């Protein structure tokens, strides 16, 4: 039920790995790219941009998500 | 999607290539090949 | 004759520089960009990504070659 940017807060405060990546992949299996960049920026300290770029660009979606990679740069 | 299958059939970077020198760049290439492997459909 | 990913093996096992770059440029002058990524991954330890990506994208036909740069990152 808490799909309006609430479970992202739990994943961020969890401070664990391999948790936010599942939410990112679910945001791509179903058309929910409107919150992909938000989930990236919130859980930046727990994600790996190298695989995030691949998953977001080549895997199952042609998404840009440029400000995230700008912050990475 | 068939182009990726053709690239795999031509130059599949299988982990069997570990018989060569254990270079860090070759390990990174093996990891990239393992990450690209699920893309075959 | 060995254009089906065989001379690439010789160029990779040669362990020399300025050898695979000629094959990469030949794969761009003629429409053979399908094996460009395979040649990059086979000769990963012998190529320079900074000029490889430029030659593959801006200097010649708009090939993506993104997984190579992703592994570089």
PDB file of C-alpha atoms in Angstrom:
ATOM      1  CA  UNK A   1       0.000   0.000   0.000  1.00  0.00           C
ATOM      2  CA  UNK A   2       2.746   2.517   0.839  1.00  0.00           C
ATOM      3  CA  UNK A   3       3.851   3.044  -2.771  1.00  0.00           C
ATOM      4  CA  UNK A   4       3.792   6.861  -2.466  1.00  0.00           C
ATOM      5  CA  UNK A   5       7.444   7.220  -1.407  1.00  0.00           C
ATOM      6  CA  UNK A   6       7.085   5.618   2.034  1.00  0.00           C
ATOM      7  CA  UNK A   7       8.803   2.226   1.726  1.00  0.00           C
ATOM      8  CA  UNK A   8      11.731   4.141   0.224  1.00  0.00           C
ATOM      9  CA  UNK A   9      12.119   5.857   3.601  1.00  0.00           C
ATOM     10  CA  UNK A  10      12.257   2.476   5.352  1.00  0.00           C
ATOM     11  CA  UNK A  11      14.845   1.217   2.856  1.00  0.00           C
ATOM     12  CA  UNK A  12      16.921   4.366   3.401  1.00  0.00           C
ATOM     13  CA  UNK A  13      16.789   4.264   7.207  1.00  0.00           C
ATOM     14  CA  UNK A  14      17.530   0.521   7.163  1.00  0.00           C
ATOM     15  CA  UNK A  15      21.142   1.325   6.143  1.00  0.00           C
ATOM     16  CA  UNK A  16      21.394  -2.156   4.588  1.00  0.00           C
ATOM     17  CA  UNK A  17      22.516  -3.288   1.141  1.00  0.00           C
ATOM     18  CA  UNK A  18      20.685  -5.306  -1.528  1.00  0.00           C
ATOM     19  CA  UNK A  19      17.396  -3.815  -0.331  1.00  0.00           C
ATOM     20  CA  UNK A  20      16.952  -0.597  -2.308  1.00  0.00           C
ATOM     21  CA  UNK A  21      18.069  -2.426  -5.456  1.00  0.00           C
ATOM     22  CA  UNK A  22      14.948  -4.597  -5.222  1.00  0.00           C
ATOM     23  CA  UNK A  23      12.762  -1.480  -5.105  1.00  0.00           C
ATOM     24  CA  UNK A  24      14.666  -0.066  -8.087  1.00  0.00           C
ATOM     25  CA  UNK A  25      14.109  -3.269 -10.071  1.00  0.00           C
ATOM     26  CA  UNK A  26      10.417  -3.269  -9.131  1.00  0.00           C
ATOM     27  CA  UNK A  27      10.180   0.343 -10.321  1.00  0.00           C
ATOM     28  CA  UNK A  28      11.366  -0.935 -13.724  1.00  0.00           C
ATOM     29  CA  UNK A  29       9.420  -4.197 -14.040  1.00  0.00           C
ATOM     30  CA  UNK A  30       6.259  -2.103 -13.619  1.00  0.00           C
ATOM     31  CA  UNK A  31       5.956   1.383 -15.097  1.00  0.00           C
ATOM     32  CA  UNK A  32       6.905   3.457 -12.029  1.00  0.00           C
ATOM     33  CA  UNK A  33       9.879   5.457 -13.331  1.00  0.00           C
ATOM     34  CA  UNK A  34       8.383   8.669 -11.903  1.00  0.00           C
ATOM     35  CA  UNK A  35       9.953   7.812  -8.521  1.00  0.00           C
ATOM     36  CA  UNK A  36      13.135   6.083  -9.734  1.00  0.00           C
ATOM     37  CA  UNK A  37      15.277   9.207  -9.416  1.00  0.00           C
ATOM     38  CA  UNK A  38      13.762   9.984  -6.019  1.00  0.00           C
ATOM     39  CA  UNK A  39      14.604   6.487  -4.766  1.00  0.00           C
ATOM     40  CA  UNK A  40      18.108   6.922  -6.196  1.00  0.00           C
ATOM     41  CA  UNK A  41      18.690  10.246  -4.429  1.00  0.00           C
ATOM     42  CA  UNK A  42      17.220   9.080  -1.112  1.00  0.00           C
ATOM     43  CA  UNK A  43      19.255   5.848  -0.911  1.00  0.00           C
ATOM     44  CA  UNK A  44      22.409   7.197  -2.578  1.00  0.00           C
ATOM     45  CA  UNK A  45      24.595   6.032   0.323  1.00  0.00           C
ATOM     46  CA  UNK A  46      23.458   2.413  -0.196  1.00  0.00           C
ATOM     47  CA  UNK A  47      23.477   2.063  -4.006  1.00  0.00           C
ATOM     48  CA  UNK A  48      26.158   1.447  -6.645  1.00  0.00           C
ATOM     49  CA  UNK A  49      25.787   3.858  -9.595  1.00  0.00           C
ATOM     50  CA  UNK A  50      27.770   1.627 -11.970  1.00  0.00           C
ATOM     51  CA  UNK A  51      25.111  -1.104 -12.003  1.00  0.00           C
ATOM     52  CA  UNK A  52      22.293   1.433 -11.496  1.00  0.00           C
ATOM     53  CA  UNK A  53      23.130   3.025 -14.853  1.00  0.00           C
ATOM     54  CA  UNK A  54      23.031  -0.362 -16.592  1.00  0.00           C
ATOM     55  CA  UNK A  55      19.782  -1.446 -14.918  1.00  0.00           C
ATOM     56  CA  UNK A  56      18.122   1.877 -15.742  1.00  0.00           C
ATOM     57  CA  UNK A  57      19.358   2.214 -19.339  1.00  0.00           C
ATOM     58  CA  UNK A  58      19.919  -1.179 -20.976  1.00  0.00           C
ATOM     59  CA  UNK A  59      18.059  -3.707 -18.848  1.00  0.00           C
ATOM     60  CA  UNK A  60      14.299  -3.198 -19.276  1.00  0.00           C
ATOM     61  CA  UNK A  61      13.882   0.552 -19.761  1.00  0.00           C
ATOM     62  CA  UNK A  62      15.274   3.482 -21.768  1.00  0.00           C
ATOM     63  CA  UNK A  63      15.503   5.897 -18.860  1.00  0.00           C
ATOM     64  CA  UNK A  64      17.918   8.819 -18.500  1.00  0.00           C
ATOM     65  CA  UNK A  65      18.038   9.631 -14.757  1.00  0.00           C
ATOM     66  CA  UNK A  66      20.723  12.217 -15.497  1.00  0.00           C
ATOM     67  CA  UNK A  67      20.767  14.287 -12.237  1.00  0.00           C
ATOM     68  CA  UNK A  68      21.688  11.139 -10.293  1.00  0.00           C
ATOM     69  CA  UNK A  69      24.743  10.565 -12.484  1.00  0.00           C
ATOM     70  CA  UNK A  70      25.549  14.283 -12.250  1.00  0.00           C
ATOM     71  CA  UNK A  71      25.632  13.973  -8.458  1.00  0.00           C
ATOM     72  CA  UNK A  72      27.784  10.857  -8.913  1.00  0.00           C
ATOM     73  CA  UNK A  73      30.193  12.897 -11.046  1.00  0.00           C
TER      74      UNK A  73
ATOM     75  CA  UNK B   1      17.295  -8.873 -29.125  1.00  0.00           C
ATOM     76  CA  UNK B   2      18.800 -11.364 -31.558  1.00  0.00           C
ATOM     77  CA  UNK B   3      21.953  -9.248 -31.923  1.00  0.00           C
ATOM     78  CA  UNK B   4      22.902  -9.886 -28.289  1.00  0.00           C
ATOM     79  CA  UNK B   5      22.344 -13.614 -28.829  1.00  0.00           C
ATOM     80  CA  UNK B   6      24.602 -13.498 -31.896  1.00  0.00           C
ATOM     81  CA  UNK B   7      27.295 -11.620 -29.955  1.00  0.00           C
ATOM     82  CA  UNK B   8      27.054 -14.248 -27.211  1.00  0.00           C
ATOM     83  CA  UNK B   9      27.279 -17.152 -29.670  1.00  0.00           C
ATOM     84  CA  UNK B  10      30.322 -15.527 -31.289  1.00  0.00           C
ATOM     85  CA  UNK B  11      32.350 -14.351 -28.276  1.00  0.00           C
ATOM     86  CA  UNK B  12      30.790 -15.692 -25.068  1.00  0.00           C
ATOM     87  CA  UNK B  13      33.230 -14.621 -22.346  1.00  0.00           C
ATOM     88  CA  UNK B  14      32.658 -17.802 -20.378  1.00  0.00           C
ATOM     89  CA  UNK B  15      34.366 -18.141 -16.955  1.00  0.00           C
ATOM     90  CA  UNK B  16      36.403 -20.907 -18.605  1.00  0.00           C
ATOM     91  CA  UNK B  17      38.669 -18.097 -19.865  1.00  0.00           C
ATOM     92  CA  UNK B  18      40.220 -18.002 -16.368  1.00  0.00           C
ATOM     93  CA  UNK B  19      42.976 -20.277 -17.727  1.00  0.00           C
ATOM     94  CA  UNK B  20      44.782 -17.096 -18.809  1.00  0.00           C
ATOM     95  CA  UNK B  21      46.725 -14.755 -16.547  1.00  0.00           C
ATOM     96  CA  UNK B  22      44.736 -13.512 -13.540  1.00  0.00           C
ATOM     97  CA  UNK B  23      44.695  -9.874 -14.622  1.00  0.00           C
ATOM     98  CA  UNK B  24      42.376  -7.483 -12.780  1.00  0.00           C
ATOM     99  CA  UNK B  25      41.110  -6.110 -16.103  1.00  0.00           C
ATOM    100  CA  UNK B  26      40.272  -9.647 -17.221  1.00  0.00           C
ATOM    101  CA  UNK B  27      38.439 -10.240 -13.933  1.00  0.00           C
ATOM    102  CA  UNK B  28      36.446  -7.050 -14.527  1.00  0.00           C
ATOM    103  CA  UNK B  29      35.639  -8.248 -18.052  1.00  0.00           C
ATOM    104  CA  UNK B  30      34.483 -11.612 -16.671  1.00  0.00           C
ATOM    105  CA  UNK B  31      32.264  -9.811 -14.154  1.00  0.00           C
ATOM    106  CA  UNK B  32      30.805  -7.638 -16.922  1.00  0.00           C
ATOM    107  CA  UNK B  33      30.136 -10.732 -19.039  1.00  0.00           C
ATOM    108  CA  UNK B  34      28.401 -12.412 -16.095  1.00  0.00           C
ATOM    109  CA  UNK B  35      26.275  -9.285 -15.610  1.00  0.00           C
ATOM    110  CA  UNK B  36      25.373  -9.184 -19.320  1.00  0.00           C
ATOM    111  CA  UNK B  37      24.561 -12.911 -19.439  1.00  0.00           C
ATOM    112  CA  UNK B  38      20.951 -12.510 -18.133  1.00  0.00           C
ATOM    113  CA  UNK B  39      20.260 -10.175 -21.083  1.00  0.00           C
ATOM    114  CA  UNK B  40      20.147 -13.184 -23.428  1.00  0.00           C
ATOM    115  CA  UNK B  41      16.502 -13.815 -24.304  1.00  0.00           C
TER     116      UNK B  41
ATOM    117  CA  UNK C   1      39.211 -14.986 -43.619  1.00  0.00           C
ATOM    118  CA  UNK C   2      39.131 -15.087 -39.803  1.00  0.00           C
ATOM    119  CA  UNK C   3      36.608 -12.254 -39.433  1.00  0.00           C
ATOM    120  CA  UNK C   4      34.219 -14.289 -37.233  1.00  0.00           C
ATOM    121  CA  UNK C   5      35.908 -13.473 -33.904  1.00  0.00           C
ATOM    122  CA  UNK C   6      39.122 -15.425 -34.546  1.00  0.00           C
ATOM    123  CA  UNK C   7      41.779 -12.812 -35.362  1.00  0.00           C
ATOM    124  CA  UNK C   8      40.508 -10.982 -32.274  1.00  0.00           C
ATOM    125  CA  UNK C   9      41.844 -13.891 -30.212  1.00  0.00           C
ATOM    126  CA  UNK C  10      45.284 -13.499 -31.804  1.00  0.00           C
ATOM    127  CA  UNK C  11      45.230  -9.742 -31.179  1.00  0.00           C
ATOM    128  CA  UNK C  12      44.265 -10.347 -27.543  1.00  0.00           C
ATOM    129  CA  UNK C  13      46.898 -13.021 -26.894  1.00  0.00           C
ATOM    130  CA  UNK C  14      49.524 -10.851 -28.615  1.00  0.00           C
ATOM    131  CA  UNK C  15      49.609  -8.719 -25.424  1.00  0.00           C
ATOM    132  CA  UNK C  16      50.702  -5.741 -27.553  1.00  0.00           C
ATOM    133  CA  UNK C  17      49.267  -2.254 -28.014  1.00  0.00           C
ATOM    134  CA  UNK C  18      48.276  -0.344 -31.165  1.00  0.00           C
ATOM    135  CA  UNK C  19      47.218  -3.661 -32.699  1.00  0.00           C
ATOM    136  CA  UNK C  20      43.612  -4.181 -31.612  1.00  0.00           C
ATOM    137  CA  UNK C  21      42.910  -0.492 -32.263  1.00  0.00           C
ATOM    138  CA  UNK C  22      43.375  -1.085 -35.997  1.00  0.00           C
ATOM    139  CA  UNK C  23      40.800  -3.890 -35.915  1.00  0.00           C
ATOM    140  CA  UNK C  24      38.447  -1.638 -33.938  1.00  0.00           C
ATOM    141  CA  UNK C  25      38.821   1.120 -36.540  1.00  0.00           C
ATOM    142  CA  UNK C  26      38.224  -1.408 -39.326  1.00  0.00           C
ATOM    143  CA  UNK C  27      35.058  -2.543 -37.534  1.00  0.00           C
ATOM    144  CA  UNK C  28      33.915   1.099 -37.756  1.00  0.00           C
ATOM    145  CA  UNK C  29      34.956   1.985 -41.315  1.00  0.00           C
ATOM    146  CA  UNK C  30      32.929  -1.031 -42.487  1.00  0.00           C
ATOM    147  CA  UNK C  31      29.525  -1.826 -41.007  1.00  0.00           C
ATOM    148  CA  UNK C  32      30.711  -4.457 -38.502  1.00  0.00           C
ATOM    149  CA  UNK C  33      29.885  -2.734 -35.203  1.00  0.00           C
ATOM    150  CA  UNK C  34      28.058  -5.852 -33.970  1.00  0.00           C
ATOM    151  CA  UNK C  35      31.352  -7.384 -32.773  1.00  0.00           C
ATOM    152  CA  UNK C  36      32.830  -4.104 -31.494  1.00  0.00           C
ATOM    153  CA  UNK C  37      31.776  -4.769 -27.904  1.00  0.00           C
ATOM    154  CA  UNK C  38      33.082  -8.333 -28.077  1.00  0.00           C
ATOM    155  CA  UNK C  39      36.439  -7.071 -29.357  1.00  0.00           C
ATOM    156  CA  UNK C  40      36.485  -4.502 -26.545  1.00  0.00           C
ATOM    157  CA  UNK C  41      35.757  -7.112 -23.868  1.00  0.00           C
ATOM    158  CA  UNK C  42      38.326  -9.555 -25.264  1.00  0.00           C
ATOM    159  CA  UNK C  43      41.063  -6.884 -25.375  1.00  0.00           C
ATOM    160  CA  UNK C  44      39.928  -5.064 -22.218  1.00  0.00           C
ATOM    161  CA  UNK C  45      43.434  -4.991 -20.712  1.00  0.00           C
ATOM    162  CA  UNK C  46      45.042  -3.692 -23.934  1.00  0.00           C
ATOM    163  CA  UNK C  47      42.766  -0.780 -24.921  1.00  0.00           C
ATOM    164  CA  UNK C  48      42.242   2.807 -23.753  1.00  0.00           C
ATOM    165  CA  UNK C  49      38.551   3.498 -23.006  1.00  0.00           C
ATOM    166  CA  UNK C  50      38.851   7.299 -23.144  1.00  0.00           C
ATOM    167  CA  UNK C  51      39.629   7.259 -26.875  1.00  0.00           C
ATOM    168  CA  UNK C  52      37.752   3.999 -27.580  1.00  0.00           C
ATOM    169  CA  UNK C  53      34.396   5.471 -26.545  1.00  0.00           C
ATOM    170  CA  UNK C  54      35.079   8.660 -28.512  1.00  0.00           C
ATOM    171  CA  UNK C  55      36.005   6.785 -31.700  1.00  0.00           C
ATOM    172  CA  UNK C  56      33.036   4.438 -31.274  1.00  0.00           C
ATOM    173  CA  UNK C  57      30.433   7.165 -30.693  1.00  0.00           C
ATOM    174  CA  UNK C  58      31.416  10.579 -32.078  1.00  0.00           C
ATOM    175  CA  UNK C  59      34.096   9.860 -34.691  1.00  0.00           C
ATOM    176  CA  UNK C  60      32.069   7.108 -36.418  1.00  0.00           C
ATOM    177  CA  UNK C  61      28.585   5.536 -36.484  1.00  0.00           C
ATOM    178  CA  UNK C  62      26.558   6.036 -33.290  1.00  0.00           C
ATOM    179  CA  UNK C  63      27.407   2.768 -31.599  1.00  0.00           C
ATOM    180  CA  UNK C  64      26.500   2.529 -27.921  1.00  0.00           C
ATOM    181  CA  UNK C  65      29.241   0.262 -26.492  1.00  0.00           C
ATOM    182  CA  UNK C  66      27.882   1.136 -23.048  1.00  0.00           C
ATOM    183  CA  UNK C  67      28.687  -2.036 -21.002  1.00  0.00           C
ATOM    184  CA  UNK C  68      32.385  -1.422 -21.712  1.00  0.00           C
ATOM    185  CA  UNK C  69      32.229   2.064 -20.191  1.00  0.00           C
ATOM    186  CA  UNK C  70      30.078   0.681 -17.360  1.00  0.00           C
ATOM    187  CA  UNK C  71      32.779  -1.835 -16.452  1.00  0.00           C
ATOM    188  CA  UNK C  72      35.336   0.973 -16.754  1.00  0.00           C
ATOM    189  CA  UNK C  73      33.310   2.976 -14.225  1.00  0.00           C
TER     190      UNK C  73
END
